[model samples]
Target: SHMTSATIPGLDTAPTNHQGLLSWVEEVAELTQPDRVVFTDGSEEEFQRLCDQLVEAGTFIRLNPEKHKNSYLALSDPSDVARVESRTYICSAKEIDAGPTNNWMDPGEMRSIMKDLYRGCMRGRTMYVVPFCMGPLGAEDPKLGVEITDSEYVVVSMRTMTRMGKAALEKMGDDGFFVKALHSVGAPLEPGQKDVAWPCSETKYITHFPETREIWSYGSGYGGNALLGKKCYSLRIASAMAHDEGWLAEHMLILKLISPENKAYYFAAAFPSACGKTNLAMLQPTIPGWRAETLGDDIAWMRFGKDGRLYAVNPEFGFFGVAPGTNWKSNPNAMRTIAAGNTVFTNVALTDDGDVWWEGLEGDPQHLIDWKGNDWYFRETETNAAHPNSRYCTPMSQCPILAPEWDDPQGVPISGILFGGRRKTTVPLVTEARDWQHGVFIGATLGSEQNVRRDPMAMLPFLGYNVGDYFQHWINLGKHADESKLPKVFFVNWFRRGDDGRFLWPGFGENSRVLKWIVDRIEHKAGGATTPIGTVPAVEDLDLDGLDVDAADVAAALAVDADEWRQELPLIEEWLQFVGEKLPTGVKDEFDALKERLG
Candidate 1:
């Protein structure tokens, strides 16, 4: 009856009055020519149905119910285990708009190529019409998207990573606009053809159309590629929208640091990929009278409030955190959230008891199945059982330390902004910015490598437009913001090492001590020792309360030698030069001032 009633050939369910959305879905269905079309209702029954379908399709292994509850494991093709950055693109109207950081293609040509790839690509698979929202549904202006994907795994994952289903469709109603996202594994099955557990192609393209707010992904079912709602819509396309609309979408983690006095300070931190961002968000502070709560792990959407302060929102419904580096000691909240079950573990080891395990997890389960679907043990081979980028996708509601105000329509007023990276030396434990512009420069100069490339705001890959324009946006936002009420900026390096090549700071929960010092600096209670880079706390003032660390280690962690900084000046200058003519003059001026002061 459902199939017969549909106006579109395969639209088994018709649930909207919006003509544009309806026509677009119909058009996409026609192009892909899926076996069936089911617009998701986002209900528990639908979720269960999809899970059962995945289990039947051999794409998911249901975990031990008694130990892990309602959880599953999905092993991807070895060739498609990680995001292929080179294949990712921003198809802008003009080459200039995509800027230096992204690969650019003309929209017309991209569409032509993709159209050929998508022709009857879903021949044997069902097309899942998933309507989803990025942030809180009740927000004044919700970020809406409709992702049409053929992967059932993606459908179920979207259920966790976003507010999806009937509620999202209803929220969009008949008039609201949504980002149009299309995805397929690019391996369409012929009749009687057998399908693999994880189907992905060697050729993958994770592309975005900034001009039309559309996403077209093919050949891969990895998180960043297949899950169009996450990075593609939330960061890449949303960032371009932010650039045009004067809001901010960033690759940041939102944390609310609570003082012993019950005062709350919401902070947003940007870090390069795999730089302990997920662990930092779910931190359990070791310092007395301090507590840290998770707001979000991967992304933050920020806008200005009427009070002239930047109010930030975690526009995600779940945390897609890396599985390799998480542990009870480092991220107890994450472990707890995963323990509550109903999660999707990707490319992690499946233990004998049907539970999931990764590299840094506490237990050493002897008999295990590795991510490559091989029987594994502690053998002579030094191969890692789990992929380095293995991920745990779980809902935020299950997190014990999830902030109460995480879904607030107005979001939380940020008090501090942190830009940090993985550095064994040179960068200090923490350095406070002199002003907003200096902070912006700190964020702009953040590097993914040089050990090399500058990853501005840790958003080098995700900044959908010109990197220079992105910097200008931050500076302009600060200029218009209420300066006295603006959030103080800080740079931290938890991985700084001593001469013996050991980490000076304990890191993990112990990093809370540095956070305590940061709060003090914001309240103007401490931090007078000014260095050329920024203001840093003295060793005595860092609140070493009840720690095993020696004074020498603390001093080393906070030290900023002029010579080390001098070596960095060239990298900074080289990066600025690479940004080309569009580089914000103000950022260059800051660089010059830092160079002269070092002299």
Candidate 2:
């Protein structure tokens, strides 16, 4: 076993055990506890540093203790509440059935919707929406929990604030507390149920030591929370924290073991409700010694790393992943790990095995009975049915190689970023994005045209988020900070099916396979070996037959050029070396597995 990696700065003694970790948090809580309430000015630098300090001293884990641990987090306003709400509540066809109106609902309203439904599910019990700051902000009511602390942390707990008070806040003030609280809240818990069960059961939020869980939610506001909910927002947060947090160390471990250098490229997509992130993440590596771990299988914080690379971090320890695949392409391991009792079942098809059969899993007999669509079915078929780990259905962290053994679980420096869409004409198997802006554009473009048309003003608000705030951030780091830093971009259309109606590999279904091919080409070049020249496949390899995009235009958008494409091998090798030296053993294994796939 591994010893706890958390350490308290300026303190002589280090936390030697979980108890010691708690003690460290308690001490910090004492120092940070305030006598009066103070409003934050929302300085990104200050907030960022506070987060950094928490991670550095391992206090981040202290706040969010563990699954089943009572915890709560502070939010600035109702918008903050919506982020958690959207992740937890599911709407029926009748609810969102109005057909992509593009009008976003306020978080308070969303919370009200959830609360009303939740009250129906569990009546006679007091439910609360607690605001967590550093310490309790004087309780508005005995039921309303508040804590004020110098440390910018929040806790979401099952216990009533009236019962716990500041002492309770101090106790649960760790990173683990935050992770557990988010997990508890993100998932629906039944009233008086001894264990958290149902809805988002397979989810595991990472609870690190020093009482700091790995996740943090700073309730800024609606715009902030909405932005925070974006995958790119997490990328920004990860980018900021990589410095002292050893995100690089962690990433090195992941790259070295899980998705190493010269390995095939990796792409992540959100399927409908239960498409199969876990099954794929833990796929007993088809190649020997190439096994992968669940990065998070749900929530991942990704951003470009030092040396101008992209890295991904696991945001949770609990598996929000639902079960159903056991009957189709079952992972007894995943089921057992989840079901050994902690797993929660959401609108799943219950079976005698104490496991939930998700209706979204392909080949499952319950498909039609339990499955529904975002609106009416765009396509009616088993394949069209939502999958368990769809976009809405996510592991607290989507990275599969997130077991503690790997380092740099935060992210791997990306060599390429892929943008994908879902139209027969507008979509192609692949096209590389030109920059972060282009990536945002494609992401925004992929939403329903009706939604885009309706929310034309807000269409892809994230694309223009903060007026190139994200772009400038990347540019400062990717281009200005390091000349060789920028990650190449790609766009893919995996939604397209072939003549046989099967996803076209080397194009659609073959994403993983083709990524492997790309890595192999680089490796051959690194070894000073000649690739059969044309053997290497870039984004151009896919046929964009129906799309109006010109080959040259498409090539330019994909960052493809004869000379750069040909030199990919050296770039691949350079990236591999950068990843290998920085990541840990398990990540190295991931890399090795990718290499084998190429071979």
Candidate 3:
């Protein structure tokens, strides 16, 4: 069992109410090793002082100073000092008071609070650890690297603390451990072959702990543990942020944010992993008077605001985009950004000069040689030259697009939401999802069964651990009367197969241009459910074949000639179906149900 330290004051060891939980967390502050704790009645001066303290202590981690020009730090890494010269920094209380206590809460709620507090600690400074996934005491196995205390809590290692703190896997049953052991020699696929039961196999299992409020289960058919171990955290972070915000914060191909802007009632969707959600959103044609920001290509948090508007915020600073086929066409400025030593490389094939190449860039040219036979891989390794997960990937608070004075990068309003997947039929490039339930269900749907074969999207709903609770929270926010009507929702798929049986970008072949068109249309209020395909320039270039749209509707709403849209609707539907067909059957069904409920 993991050891129990003295509880911090103002925190609930067993809180059941919000106030109690706050107090309990506060009381347990010392236990979490907070550097200092301060309380305020919500004064701006105090907040400013707190911000100053954060900068003084180097707590802020800037993510996109170049793009946002915000001084806020994305994370506190020593490497950022020379990279970003901005002034403001990411800020969080060093050792925040844990809680006063919440009496009306269950174990899951308490656990969530703990997790939040732990996250808060890392918000602007070095990472910290808390007791989680606790197990039987004395069952500790130092060899497997786990510390079991008399209490049920089990201590594990985080990548950030692996270098300094006691290794969490100090002890444990090797066979019982789920993920493949690090540094062990075995068949490449052997580690992933091990099967682990879903954390929420049983319905009531979550009630046993306060942190299980967002419990989710993996179906039996899911892949092995290695894949889960490598991608679980990233997946969870993405889904959690999506659940909290309308947009998914993803770091691929540049920090791209995919959400609706103020003028549009809905937004478009992309295909499975490696699709151009980032490129389309950030690189799209310049929309007049509209702005773009990279929340992340891979992860983000979304939430409904007091005004009933949904917002998206990126939680990461780096990019994890694919190298093959990605070029200026998809991310014009991005390719240059990485070339300047301003970015990190990953998973691509090595160049003749022993450096990895970004396809068209001026590096030694090479191709993937491994069995996976892909361009490259992106992960942290002492030997690998570049990886988003590496120390070099760093934060983007320095990004020019990021706000120079962003108080909390985590908070951004979502104005639109979209859901899509790869498919051959039965999906449209842009059909509005009528409401929140439908929108979320569609967003939750994993795009492709093949893409999800290894590290499936099953873990999405499990983010923050409680799927039901997440739904309830979302429903409450969706129903907020004052909030902007739930973000307009759209399902899009731009990938289309050609006569040569090769996939191709169906529209402008330039995601940036497509986005610029979308932005322009919205600015004129000519982008809505009623807008016809023929009248919209952004979508006009798309090839619509075999589609069955209401020609009269398109003609009347868009003020276009019937013949013009007649030639475009099919291509739009084809693009939608091209991606929708790849989604898991269950996800598709759930999305259909959500649509039904809203209709």
Candidate 4:
């Protein structure tokens, strides 16, 4: 009863015994038709073999063992160093499902184009089958997927990043449901051809077909592009799946916080990129007795428990963290985590002795090679020696402050949900939502200025998606969920700038103070004055006993300028227009109430 159309000429001889896997493998094989096929077992021997092959292929360089043991350095094509957001596409059955934030394409058209691009693209390459799980082994209903790629570099990276190999193979035995992901470097070799360090095509596409739960990627081998499990499945595809399954897949970080009284609380925070997410997750609390333990640094998967409270699990095993601005003073846990061996350094400076260095790593080392593999010298007129977006791929188990229950399948029940952004003014240091509906509105209108110059059409920071639909998701959740069981929501801004453009808050470990206030409010130990924006604390309500910052600045940081906020309302109204007809009437009523209160 097998479908002959799915079968390819070379697939009949493939080693895989699983029928369902064979069908999809054969389907891809029929489309791509590689010269060879290899199934990865995710063993140490296989990792070593792949590493050796990568070295020979100029894809990696083994560092000197004396300086950085069991580490390797890699350089990607300058044009392909980061994710190409412009080329990423969401191909859904209906255009509305893709939303406004994503670049949408008709599924049929995208399939036709991808089919043409994949045809014979793997002609001279070996197809690597990598089966991996997103969560811990033996966890109930853990997310699982198999990435088929043509790059050996990707295979080794996936080995360290995911619980791959025999475990995944055993878990995926004749699988029930798993994400089918196919990726290619999109550069096929010709007769008597020579290979480059990183062979990639100028045409790149990171496409997702949500209806079928499939991902097809081509052209680039960057972490976000080739590593299908990271952003692609963990957030993009998983979010769509979660929407239907009554769960949530969000771009959030999970952390466990312990107070001086031995009380513990779990928090799930959502912030746009470069908003001190990792720093906060691994914070070394300056205020003694407050302990922060890292559960995850990037993505989170959450679901409502039988008790009606939301519980969250970190789906990834490693941290693909930003290399710059991570030092002893900023994120000591991250520094310690990467200081050990078995790490992969990408697009970062290399020291003379083979140690890795980035922009903010403590104490400059002399005689260094920059990220571009060029001799380095820092000058005001010269460009940055290290890429701003350089990354350190370190395992989560290496984190010194890792939570004891980091791999708990049942997950930690969340007490608070914090939404944040990078804003210079208007937004308060923190604001508590009166209820779930107000919190939905707070998140719907969350905004931040542009951090980098990209496509002018792309909205920066939060509310990048259709704000109306996003808020509707929250409102609808309340319809089915117990209101009292939902986590309390709050908004925080650590990046508030003062009149002179200097930071208002001394925001490193000092952020623990703000978190202390948040916990106090959640536990009813503290109260705040109700404002038009939301609930904001008085200066004395915050714990500034150990804070070294000025009292005046602390007061100013918590102050809300009604004038500035009034100016911001028109902008919010403009955005509500973009949200269109689907914008809920409750949100409109809230807007009207806010405006009348402001008057």
Candidate 5:
């Protein structure tokens, strides 16, 4: 009875053949009752039109032509510039499954509350329906979703960040299964009222209903809150879907590396925030004849292919990269990508000449307005000129080092999977996992000591979902998948500190040496010594020929201290216990084995 072929003369309607989509849209339309409904076509003209509208409304400031061609600068509401972690919740049918990492709410209760909150929320505003494909459009089984939002900023951003519009809708039509997502600024307009630069309500909720594969977000107009496709559906919601579908969805970066011999190998790496995920994705390899090409810089959706090898594709078409610490030295490809044009710089400083500037963009601007639209002057007491999470939203196609097959539906076969976290000590530069189960153990226990008080595991913020269940999902895949088909796993730490509190290893492009050894080990051209924890290459085995650092320094960087690890054992045990019955026996066995090896 929910289904209908009813069409509004000027509004975009769902394909009548797709009953589920039609019914869902009708249900939303019935509730929200917007002034107009627009289905995005993902065309350049449409993007320009939206951009022009936003500029006309004083929501965006067009940047100077010479420096940042076709780029725009926008400032968010000072209060709504970042994600509200406290307000995010997972509404599940059962509380136990939401785990300790996520805030859990009763599904029925959440539904009633959200229904009330969303009622007439879109009144006086236009509802834009964004049909988007997360991976390659023609991929055999691409992930699909349709995000309905009231913000034009979100619609334009999605156009650059996703393969959206008609193509995605056609793909969804072929298969009725699609993630249903809804978002709003939560600010309703009054009669004769004018819109603000960023219209958002202080009462915010980023709610997910895992049972129904749906997302409903309200209040904030920030990227993480309003752009439902990015972290919300891709990692948070899709991770749950990947669990049921016998695949993997992770907060990881995908890159393709080519050796001097012209042989190519693919890597999928996961690192906690500010731990060099973007730098590695677009790395400028310092070693001679080696090259790195990016596939995706944010989230990767992986599944087993017909060849018995684990294949992965970047679920995102663009980089929503952090603006701070991104420079020619750290990430040249990213700098190059943004330089060409069509970038949206948010929560970053604006120069007097109309160009965007951030802390680490290679030079200091004499005159500037900070992210808060305030007069900028560096001072010890004042906050940072640019927000820590300030971001540049640009298409992946603009990346100078983008892989030729980045858009391929089949995806690249992964040869190495690396789990990394920021660590002052104890964790080594790189260590190979003994097997798939050991790899799961490595990921579950991954953490950094930087902010220890909040997260013992140091993974809750970055994993994007339940950490314990996520680890179990990895172990569960081992039972379903052939061990031989699995990519060789390794643990890496680029943030290791020295005795004087300085970085031990020269990270950036120098990381290519570490990657070289991983590929060599995979091809049987290299070997490693078996440690109690994992397999670690001898200092001599690493390709440091071109590096200028001392040999002793390299050894120090790769050092594994028994005393530090001994202290870490109890913490791991406590976390595993917290994970409770859902923690796989194999994972615990691996831990016990590690403790024995250390002793």
Candidate 6:
């Protein structure tokens, strides 16, 4: 039992003595065999110390504090920069439980192989025990998890992304259930051998045991894999837990939209990856007096209350968002959030003045250190200065427009649910579902023609169980809640193209005008022309007060020509066929009804 690393003391002083957690940690320590064990307290001192050690180990470069206060830059191994979809597995006990969309492996066989790989994998490193809560700790049902990892980077990132450490353990008490997540970089140090800045194995595995609510990640120390608290626990595993427990854990952003008259309505919207999701979360309205407040930018956990209305809470404490095309114009609050610092920027270009820059940042800095650690100048390289998937990890508390009720354990009552995708034609600017079952079909068929991913409600990669069952879960919720109290659903598309091959609607802030109509329709103060596809706002119904959009262009954006919509039937059928029997009857009924109406 060698605990001689004086740099980080207090190995025996773990805050909790929960037998369940203690027993699991003991088992993991015996399996991985790390030299020492460290329990993080989520303290500033611990963070600074870890930062210092990472800097000494060459894994982190501290940016000039004069400009980028308490910020650092890191570069992952070239091969391990993103989530490895091929290697990701949902190790449910039965094959069907993992579903057709997710890669499945038998639990016993997976455990055996992963155990052999994890055996003695932490030879010279410290095993960090990170206690975290997905949503507010004071909620009616507090969601809890603990991620044990060998990577200090993961621990650091968790601090930004979650309400971690002491409070979480304290809240869990002795018998409270928590998700168990294990991670390792899989590069062990032999006696007297030096270590590389970034340690990762060529072979990687991201395994999730949904039946047991456990996650085992190996080889890579990238964001999504290593930081198992976010995507793994909150979305994948929690989604499974959410279904069984009568709640919804979705990959969505819940924003509180406040109108000029000071009325607030909460809306939860889901979009596939890179569909300007984060920008919409922190949207700055172009229309005067129309304001948007950020709540949960990445994930939303919703439950039906005693009042029979759906309520939602953001499960994350931080914003782990992409950096490219993020500028003052696109997201000013994002700029402000990262500027407050204590951020970890990955694969974004570094400036000589000690700041970070991506392609679309405001100032065009000439001299720069590119993401690949190359000394780059404008037009000197074949590649862009920053990687396409550059990311910034920052605290949500730093967001200028974070909703006051974001941390409310009871959550904000959701008024409307919006499902959208990037497409140029056939799909209108917006469409309201006839009812809850109709909404399920809209979400079931949420796809992009401009982008041909067969994703439903943007849950393709993250759906934990049978996709059909997930659809039924949504339909079931509508049944449980009073129809009058349940949220109305709508489908929106902002990427519609005009005849000139230009965007029909000016997106970004002007999208608030669209939001205004949604709120108005929710309050029944607005009317729409019922098209075959769905209900769409008439050109005159759209509040074009300060907008420069032509009446023809607005009409085109909202037009659902029967000929244009006929092209969607086959594509929708393809996705429905993919779901097959798992697709709920209500969803299938809505699809059939849509066909009949269109014909």
| C-alpha RMSD for every candidate | 2.1, 17.3, 16.3, 3.3, 2.7, 2.2
| Model 3 poorest ten-residue lDDT run | 148-157
Clashes of 3: 162
Model 5 spans with C-alpha error above 4 angstroms? 1-9, 12-17, 377-383, 451-459, 462-466
Which residue runs does candidate 3 get wrong by more than 4 Å? 1-271, 286-291, 322-329, 342-354, 358-394, 397-410, 444-473, 481-485, 498-509, 512-524, 527-599
Q: Count clashes in each candidate, considering only residues at least 3 apart in sequence or on different chains.
A: 3, 137, 162, 1, 0, 1
Model 5 lowest lDDT segment of ten: 1-10
**Candidate 6 stretches greater than 4 Å from native:** 1-16, 449-451
Per-residue alpha-carbon lDDT of candidate 2 for residues 26-74, written as tens digits (9 for 90 to 100): 4322322212122222333534454454345332221222321222111
lDDT of 6 at 399: 89
User: Please, what are the lDDT tens digits per residue for candidate 4 over residues 269-374?
Assistant: 8877777789888877778899999899778888889999999998887888888888887777888888776778788887877777888888777657887878
For model 4, which pairs clash? Answer: 41-165
Overall lDDT per candidate, in order of appearance = 0.87, 0.31, 0.32, 0.80, 0.83, 0.87
Model 2 worst lDDT run, 10 consecutive residues:
248-257
For all predicted structures, in order, the TM-scores are 0.97, 0.42, 0.45, 0.94, 0.95, 0.97
Query: Could you tell me the TM-score of candidate 5?
Result: 0.95
lDDT of 6 by residue, 1-599 (tens): 53333322334565546878877777788777787788887889999999999989888899988877899998777788865898999988887777888999998999999999998898888899999988888987788899999999899999989998889988888889999999999998887789888899998999999888989999999988888977998889989998899999998999999988998999999998887678788888888888899997789989988888889998899989889988887788889988899999988999988888989897878778888888888766667888889899999998889999988899999999999988878788888888888898898889865346667888988988888999999999887678999899999999999879999888888888889899999999999988777789988998888788788998899988998778888888888888866778888888889999999
Model 4 poorest 10 in a row by lDDT: 453-462
After the best TM-score superposition of candidate 4, give how far the Cα of residue 439 lies from its true spot, in angstroms. 0.8
Clashes of 6: 1
Tens digits of per-residue lDDT, candidate 3, 316-337, equal 3344344555555556545544
Q: What TM-score would you give candidate 6 relative to the actual structure?
A: 0.97
